Amino acid sequence: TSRNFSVGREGLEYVWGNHEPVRVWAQESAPGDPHGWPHEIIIHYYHRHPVYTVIVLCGVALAILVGTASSAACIAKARRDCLTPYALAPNATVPTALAVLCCI
């Protein structure tokens, strides 16, 4: 027969019949390269610590998303608070010098 046993960093001891106990430890020989491109980095760290890698990748995606939304909102309200007051006020004229400096 064949039996499958999970070995961690701490080790595993198996005794087969009247044999001396034999101990085996597990190394981080995860598929991928931690020093290569980002996707091999991701494969390595996912195969090593999956939940930690998922948490970190979700955190970085959240960090980019809130911050892209924040920059977009800041540029948006700045654009509107520069455009609505007098740039496009009724019967109001804004020449090139203070129009093209940011507009279009």
């Binding site: 080790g11 430890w25 020989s29 390269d33 931690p34 309200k77």
Partner: protein, 439 residues
Amino acid sequence: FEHATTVPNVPGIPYKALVERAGYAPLNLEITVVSSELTPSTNKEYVTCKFHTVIPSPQVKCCGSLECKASSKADYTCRVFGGVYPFMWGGAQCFCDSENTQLSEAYVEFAPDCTIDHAVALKVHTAALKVGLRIVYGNTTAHLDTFVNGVTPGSSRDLKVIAGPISAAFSPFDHKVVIRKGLVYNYDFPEYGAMKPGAFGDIQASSLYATDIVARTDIRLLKPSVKNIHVPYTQAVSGYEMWKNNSGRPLQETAPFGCKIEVEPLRASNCAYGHIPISIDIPDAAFVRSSESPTILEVSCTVADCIYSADFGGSLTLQYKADREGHCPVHSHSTTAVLKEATTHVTATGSITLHFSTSSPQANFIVSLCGKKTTCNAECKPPADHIIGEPHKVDQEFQAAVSKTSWNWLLALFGGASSLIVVGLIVLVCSSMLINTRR
């Protein structure tokens, strides 16, 4: 001198420390836990084994009445039956017809083979850790055994090492333990005096040759039916035999932390758990002045190739220039990298190749050659073998465990997120005073 080190309690991996005092050359220290003992305080509740049902020779009164008496033997059951007329080989044994009375007795003894086949019920209190050390300072090696309690000065000759309290209190034994033929079981045995028929401990005694045996084996004495003389009885099974059939696996195979459970005395040897705060008092003869010790002028560390594995999967050559011959100790001032060799022979101008083990995916540690520490840079590839037969010499951190390329990617993305926030804020304020100046 006093050195406060935290030696991980794993039996076989030396912990390399560097004790340095002002005006003296650094001294290499090596604390190895050759052995460990977890001895708990025990209390023998009782002794149990298979019981032998002693049925004495029946007593019959031919024309008269018999009375049950009180006896102190284990599970002494007595009953008196009304009309018997018993027969032996030779005919009837009484002259009356139905006024004959029988007295059935049945108690419980210890089986003759119980001197070898018996179980000891024990209660174990707090445990004591007693470790053996191989402290190496300079070129003198001291072997000593010390109690890990925080106050005991366990010293071999003059070392004066004090092992502080263990960080975590761990015991493979719970409150109640059963020892049978060298095997150790964690069983909730019945207390002394409360024995249940058909279960472990149905017969109890303070010793094998004690006279105060107590038992409860459910001996029911039945009415004789055949004409021949007979004490008919029915009884529960041996709780010892039932427990032997349903014993499970011993603590010798179910113990955590890879402990070796041993008896006489009961102990758990070579357990790998926690940290031992060892404080050492090195004799002044070991230390040497800096004047007559070799002095390094320029040391540069280059690491050829490395992997992060349990063994010494790393190479580290360093080119130094020193003024004199001698032996200068080396040390890695990093928790993620350790060095196989500690003392190196210095030959004026030259190089020495030092093997190291690391668990971070990088050699980014500081190596001191009797002073003048230098930094090392490398990339440590993942190992080839998946399973190794040797413990990991270094514990796994987080900042170490994340590589510099991954750190750069994460830092770049998070810093871009922060730069978006700050550029949004500066644009917001720019527009704010723009509006303020507009009106």
